[PDB]
């Protein structure tokens, strides 16, 4: 799991589950090549996007689906994603999780990078 | 004023308004002082706390009556208060500003500390 | 202004002064279009992005340059930017704030929305 | 593990290693009595604090020693500590994770309630 992303609620102080998540990487031509996608589970983490062998050096955009999972519990958010853009790998492998907490009007992200 | 405090609310993208706040200072027995109070205005903020003069040196907490102001908007909160406690050191920027925001499970405090 | 945008600095406890910031319109053809940019002044503010008149309901892009400021500060940061994705809606109060504070290795955004 | 805290660094994009936590329960005459403490680990976790039979309905603080970690790293950070106090087990027994998200001026704290 060099790539896992985990998203918490601060309303509900809860995991956000069912929470779509799409990573693209920049292509040579600059645009957004779809990468891997999948959705939070129960814990609200995400793993299995990708292998160390998939995941080389490159611009990664991480797209978590905030407006979808808002408006599938009936709430209207402001937001209508929350992207998280970033070069990963070019010093060698890392693992990296991408961590949001969202509210309707806000929300947080941090990152974790660990060299194993 | 050397001391301001600022408060939104990431639920409803809004200002936090009339939100009980109490400053206290630590005095030396280490217990703490009241030193003033106020409720948030129209656009959040808390402005006339203290002056110059009386704004000296030492350890202050400005407590933030969190729960009052969900409750009032009808959610169940998790924190009995917001509690941000700081030194005030001379030798720093002159002028405070304690920002805090709000969701029912969560919240930030930032400081913004500058010279005119 | 219709729309304002504020940065600051988590590390220094400051406003984030010469940031670069632009704004884009999502067109028809779902490509973004450029609609407004300029660099937050000495309050972390930039003011004056836009009137009444031209912003007009749609989904704009605010993107924050936040690697070139840490870059400045001599820090080397996570992300490439921040990316602040909305839909205007007449329906809600008139005026916008995007506030975002910023990390090396993290950052908040939060939306301020008021009617005079 | 009825309680347990996690603390990352958003400047290092990394977990909050050794960061001491002293947990507190306000007592029948409203003064905080010590309930348990600790540091956390290479994850950024502390695990163990108390146990089921322990951990009765009260209102506690968690106090984050956000100061000594800054400092034992050579920074001089603006925060005392963070407190987080909330009423606990009110309704039955639940598990609580309580999260923070440190910078030297600014933190942010969250709360994960689940029902075991
Ligand atoms: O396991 C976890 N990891 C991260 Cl990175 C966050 Cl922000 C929160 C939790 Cl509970
Ligand atoms: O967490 C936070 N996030 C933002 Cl965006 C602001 Cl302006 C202030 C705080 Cl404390
Ligand atoms: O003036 C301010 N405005 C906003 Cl919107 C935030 Cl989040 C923080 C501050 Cl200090
Ligand atoms: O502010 C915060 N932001 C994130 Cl992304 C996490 Cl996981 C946790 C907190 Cl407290
Ligand atoms: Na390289
Ligand atoms: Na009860």
Same mark, same amino acid.
């Given at each position: 799991?060099?790539?896992?992303?985990?998203?918490?609620?601060?309303?509900?102080?809860?995991?956000?589950?069912?929470?779509?998540?799409?990573?693209?990487?920049?292509?040579?031509?600059?645009?957004? $090549?779809?990468?891997?996608?999948?959705?939070?589970?129960?814990?609200?983490?995400?793993?299995?996007?990708?292998?160390? $062998?998939?995941?080389? $050096?490159?611009?990664?955009?991480?797209?978590?689906?905030?407006?979808?999972?808002?408006?599938?519990?009936?709430?209207?958010?402001?937001?209508?994603?929350? $992207?998280?853009?970033?070069?990963?790998?070019?010093?060698?492998?890392?693992?990296?999780?991408?961590?949001?907490?969202?509210?309707?009007?806000?929300?947080?992200?941090?990152?974790?990078?660990?060299?194993?």
């Amino acid at each position: 799991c060099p790539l896992m992303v985990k998203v918490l609620d601060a309303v509900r102080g809860s995991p956000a589950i069912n929470v779509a998540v799409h990573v693209f990487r920049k292509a040579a031509d600059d645009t957004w $090549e779809p990468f891997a996608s999948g959705k939070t589970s129960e814990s609200g983490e995400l793993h299995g996007l990708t292998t160390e $062998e998939e995941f080389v $050096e490159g611009i990664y955009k991480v797209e978590i689906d905030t407006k979808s999972y808002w408006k599938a519990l009936g709430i209207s958010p402001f937001h209508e994603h929350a $992207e998280v853009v970033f070069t990963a790998n070019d010093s060698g492998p890392r693992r990296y999780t991408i961590a949001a907490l969202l509210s309707p009007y806000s929300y947080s992200t941090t990152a974790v990078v660990t060299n194993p």
